[PDB]
Amino acid sequence: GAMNSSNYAELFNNDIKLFVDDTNVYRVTVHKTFEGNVATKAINGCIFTLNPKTGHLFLKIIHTSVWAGQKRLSQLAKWKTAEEVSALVRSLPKEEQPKQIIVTRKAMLDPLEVHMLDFPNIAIRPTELRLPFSAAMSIDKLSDVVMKATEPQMVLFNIYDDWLDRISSYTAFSRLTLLLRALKTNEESAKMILLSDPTITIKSYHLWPSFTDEQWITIESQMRDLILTEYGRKYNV
Amino acid sequence: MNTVPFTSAPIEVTIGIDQYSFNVKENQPFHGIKDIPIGHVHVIHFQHADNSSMRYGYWFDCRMGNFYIQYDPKDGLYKMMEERDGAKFENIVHNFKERQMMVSYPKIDEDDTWYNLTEFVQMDKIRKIVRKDENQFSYVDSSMTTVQENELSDPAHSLNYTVINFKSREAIRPGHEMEDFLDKSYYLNTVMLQGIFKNSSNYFGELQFAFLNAMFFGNYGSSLQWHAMIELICSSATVPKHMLDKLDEILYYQIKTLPEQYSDILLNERVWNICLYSSFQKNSLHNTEKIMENKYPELL
Numbered sequence A: 001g002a003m004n005s006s007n008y009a010e011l012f013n014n015d016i017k018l019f020v021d022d023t024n025v026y027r028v029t030v031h032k033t034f035e036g037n038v039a040t041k042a043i044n045g046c047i048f049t050l051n052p053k054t055g056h057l058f059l060k061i062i063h064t065s066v067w068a069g070q071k072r073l074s075q076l077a078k079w080k081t082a083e084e085v086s087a088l089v090r091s092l093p094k095e096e097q098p099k100q101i102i103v104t105r106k107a108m109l110d111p112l113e114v115h116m117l118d119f120p121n122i123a124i125r126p127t128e129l130r131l132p133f134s135a136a137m138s139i140d141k142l143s144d145v146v147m148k149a150t151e152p153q154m155v156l157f158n159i160y161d162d163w164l165d166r167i168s169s170y171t172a173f174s175r176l177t178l179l180l181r182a183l184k185t186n187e188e189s190a191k192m193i194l195l196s197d198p199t200i201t202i203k204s205y206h207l208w209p210s211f212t213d214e215q216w217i218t219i220e221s222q223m224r225d226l227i228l229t230e231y232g233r234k235y236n237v
Numbered sequence B: 001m002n003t004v005p006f007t008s009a010p011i012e013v014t015i016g017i018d019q020y021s022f023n024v025k026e027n028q029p030f031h032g033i034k035d036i037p038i039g040h041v042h043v044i045h046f047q048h049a050d051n052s053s054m055r056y057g058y059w060f061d062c063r064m065g066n067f068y069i070q071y072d073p074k075d076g077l078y079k080m081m082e083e084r085d086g087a088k089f090e091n092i093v094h095n096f097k098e099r100q101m102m103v104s105y106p107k108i109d110e111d112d113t114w115y116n117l118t119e120f121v122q123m124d125k126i127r128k129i130v131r132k133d134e135n136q137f138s139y140v141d142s143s144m145t146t147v148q149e150n151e152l153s154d155p156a157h158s159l160n161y162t163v164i165n166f167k168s169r170e171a172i173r174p175g176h177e178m179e180d181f182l183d184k185s186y187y188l189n190t191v192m193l194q195g196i197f198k199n200s201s202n203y204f205g206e207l208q209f210a211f212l213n214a215m216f217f218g219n220y221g222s223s224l225q226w227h228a229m230i231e232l233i234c235s236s237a238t239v240p241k242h243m244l245d246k247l248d249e250i251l252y253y254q255i256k257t258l259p260e261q262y263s264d265i266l267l268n269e270r271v272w273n274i275c276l277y278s279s280f281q282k283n284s285l286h287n288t289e290k291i292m293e294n295k296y297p298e299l300l
C-alpha cells in the first residue's frame, strides 16, 4: 500500500525501487498579453526518478516542444510522465527493473498503473511522506542541464555524490531530504550556507560540495536552523 | 397464458413472480401461479419466512417447457422441475384452476413495466451466464459470485457475466494509454460491442439481467456488473445515438421500479454522480436524470 513513516526502512532494503516526482514536468511563467489578457509560456522541465538506496537519478528532461499543440497540459503531463517512466523501465535489463515505483503525488497512480499494465508484478504505490523533490531545480547543475536542453534528453546523476563510501543509504537519504527541504524553504540562504566557504568546492563530477564528515554535521545543523528560522518567520513564533 | 403449478407449500415463504410478491403460510392450500404472460422471460423467487438468508429463484420461459415447483425437504428449498408428460401436466393445471388454488399473475393492462425491464433479456443468453445445461431454467441466489469476483470459489455455481475492467490490457491499447483510459469508446465499441456481444441488444440484455438479479436477490456481484456496464457507456465519447436513447429508457424503468427503501444498497453514488454530471454522456440521459433527481436527490 502507501509508503509512510511506519515502513520507512523499506526504502533501503535490497528490493529495487524508484521514487517518481512529476512536480517539475510541466513548468510555466505567466505574463500579460498586449491586449491585457494573461497567457502562459512553458519552460523546459524534468521527471525526477530516484533510486533511494543507490542515489541513481534518472533525470528525463522535458523539452517545451512536447507541449506544442496539445491541450489540457497539466493532465497530459501526468500521462507523459507515466509514458517516460514506463519507457525507462523497459530500457533497463530485467535484473535492474524496479519491484516497486513510489509516486510522490497520488494523481500519478492511474496514469502509471495504466502505462505499466505489461508489468503486473511491479507495485505502484503512493506515499504519506511529504518529500521535497520539487526543489531538485534548486541544484545548480540539474537546473543548468534542464534549461540548456534543445531536445528531449535523459541525464544520469548520482544525487548522493560519493557519500555512500562513508555513510549508509538511510543517512544519505536523510541528508538529501534535509538539503532539499532547506532549498525549498529558503533557497537563497540554503545556497549561502552551502557555498559560504570558498575553500570547499564542488568537484566537476559532483552536485554538492566536498565536505568532510565534521563539516557535514555543521552544514546539517545550519540547514535545520534555517528551516526552524523560516518556520518562525512564517507563523510569527 | 401459461402456468407454473406447485405440488404444495409446506414451509411459510414469500413468493416473488417478476416484480410482484405475496406471502404463503405454512401448509396453506397453494398450488401455483396462472395467467403468466407469454413472450417474456420470467423469474419466480423465494424468501423463507423462518430464514430470510438466501433469496433464491429461477429464470424461465414457459414457451420452452412445462415447469412446476416442488419443495425438497432434504435440500430445504422450493425447486423448479420440468414435466415432460404434457398430458399429465395439462390435467394437473386444469384441476388446480378448477379448484381455484392458484394466484393470477396480476398484470394491469396499461402496465408495460415487465416488458420494459426485460426488453433485451433472452433465455438463451441467461443460460450462458448461468451454466447448468441439463435444465431449461436457471437458478440464481443471493450468494452466487461472478467470474470476476472469483478472480480477485466454486466455478460451477458462478455468474459468468462478461468481465469489464477499466485497468486491463483488454481495455487499453498499447500506445493509446491516455486516450483509451479517458475515453472508453475503443473498449465499448470495438472490444465489447463488435468483439464480444456482437450487438447492442445482447449488451443491454446482460445489463438488464444484472440489474434484475441485483434487485430481486440482493446479489452484490450483479450490482457491480450493472454499474460497470452503465459506466462503460457513459465514459465513452462516441456512442451510437440509438444506444444512448435506449439506455436512457432502460435506466429510467430500472430506477422507477427499484424499492425506495433499497436505494442505499443498490445504487453506487460514485458511478451515478459521475455518469449523470461529469461523464461524456452527462447530458444524454434526460429521462434517467429527471427520475433520479426527483426520487433519490440524497444520493446526489
Ligand SMILES: O=C(O)[C@H]1CCCCN1Cc1ccccc1
Pocket: A023, A024, A026, A027, A028, A029, A030
Ligand atoms: O511552473 C512552475 O513550476 C515554476 C517554473 C518557474 C517559474 C514559475 N513556477 C510556477 C509558477 C506558475 C505560474 C505563476 C507563478 C509561478
